[PDB]
Amino acid sequence: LVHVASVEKGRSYEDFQKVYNAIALKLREDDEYDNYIGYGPVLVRLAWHISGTWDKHDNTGGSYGGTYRFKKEFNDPSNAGLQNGFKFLEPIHKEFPWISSGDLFSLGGVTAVQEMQGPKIPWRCGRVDTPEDTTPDNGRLPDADKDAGYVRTFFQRLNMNDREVVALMGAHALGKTHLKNSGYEGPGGAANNVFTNEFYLNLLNEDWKLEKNDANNEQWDSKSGYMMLPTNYSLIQDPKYLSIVKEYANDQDKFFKDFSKAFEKLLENGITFPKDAPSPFIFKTLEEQGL
Numbered sequence: 391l392v393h394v395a396s397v398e399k400g401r402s403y404e405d406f407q408k409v410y411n412a413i414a415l416k417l418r419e420d421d422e423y424d425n426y427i428g429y430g431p432v433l434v435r436l437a438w439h440i441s442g443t444w445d446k447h448d449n450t451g452g453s454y455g456g457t458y459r460f461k462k463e464f465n466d467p468s469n470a471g472l473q474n475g476f477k478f479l480e481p482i483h484k485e486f487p488w489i490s491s492g493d494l495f496s497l498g499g500v501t502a503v504q505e506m507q508g509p510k511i512p513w514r515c516g517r518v519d520t521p522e523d524t525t526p527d528n529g530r531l532p533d534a535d536k537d538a539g540y541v542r543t544f545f546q547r548l549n550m551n552d553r554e555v556v557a558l559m560g561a562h563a564l565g566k567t568h569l570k571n572s573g574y575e576g577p578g579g580a581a582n583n584v585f586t587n588e589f590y591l592n593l594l595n596e597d598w599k600l601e602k603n604d605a606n607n608e609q610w611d612s613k614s615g616y617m618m619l620p621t622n623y624s625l626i627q628d629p630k631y632l633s634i635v636k637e638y639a640n641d642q643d644k645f646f647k648d649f650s651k652a653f654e655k656l657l658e659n660g661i662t663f664p665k666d667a668p669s670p671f672i673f674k675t676l677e678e679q680g681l
């Protein structure tokens with residue numbers, strides 16, 4: 391498989407900035423979702439899940455083809471709860487019918503990180519909708535009940551190394567686990583719709599206790615009301631992951647820098663960019679625009 395990025399015909403930076411503006415204006419507006427967490431956290435999770443299906447061995451899956459729109463990928467058990475992020479973006483797609491689905495689902499994640507005070511994420515247009523038979527089979531997305539060795543092996547399929555994996559996992563400072571979606575319950579911290587290095591500080595500073603929850607899954611719980619998935623708790627049981635955790639806990643700007651690079655890499659895996667293609671766009675926030 392080769393997936394060559396093709397620009398939506400006749401569109402430039404200013405068009406994509408209009409789609410970004412519509413998603414961010416709708417984020418401000420619908421602030422009541424999930425006990426006033428807002429749709430920020432569920433939109434960066436949709437962008438990682440349509441990206442996380444990629445397989446470096448045969449160039450299948452990844453963000454290119456927009457195939458989350460098809461029933462098979464939409465109804466995957468590991469995607470439960472993401473129907474909310476899809477529903478949110480749907481009026482935005484009716485307003486800009488020219489943008490491809492892969493470009494929309496992925497720009498949704500970029501807009502959410504930057505509106506939640508996160509780092510600027512460079513983004514590239516050019517994903518193209520592919521047919522229903524290119525939709526990846528279920529089961530390429532990761533389990534939560536596992537250890538640091540599973541996490542290392544998994545992210546190798548997306549050729550993410552240790553630094554990339556630890557930066558990327560910092561996203562779990564956002565939102566929460568929901569019992570009806572995943573069999574896990576609880577937030578990762580206090581500031582869960584502001585993008586910070588909080589996930590790392592919690593993992594180093596809380597007295598975590600292992601307990602079973604109401605779905606009979608184990609998770610790590612702290613006195614403070616926060617939780618950790620076994621796979622996130624893994625990052626302090628592995629000596630290479632633990633030194634990077636410590637680095638991000640002590641330096642939020644190094645976390646922002648590395649998260650920016652790894653998240654763009656994640657959203658562009660599997661896509662060939664012709665060098666006449668536009669350079670990656672940096673979108674302005676609402677605030678920077680006075681909107």
Ligand code: HEM
Binds near residue numbers: 431558567571572653
């Ligand atoms: C081994 C890797 C990962 C596993 C096993 C995993 C698993 C999960 C699970 C079980 C949930 C809760 C789902 C729910 O009940 O609603 C969750 C939530 C979330 N995940 Fe991950 N995750 C992984 C990697 C990532 C990465 C790479 C990102 C983003 C860069 C990410 C971002 C999020 C966010 C923001 C949420 C919050 C969802 C919400 O608030 O609704 N995850 N993750």
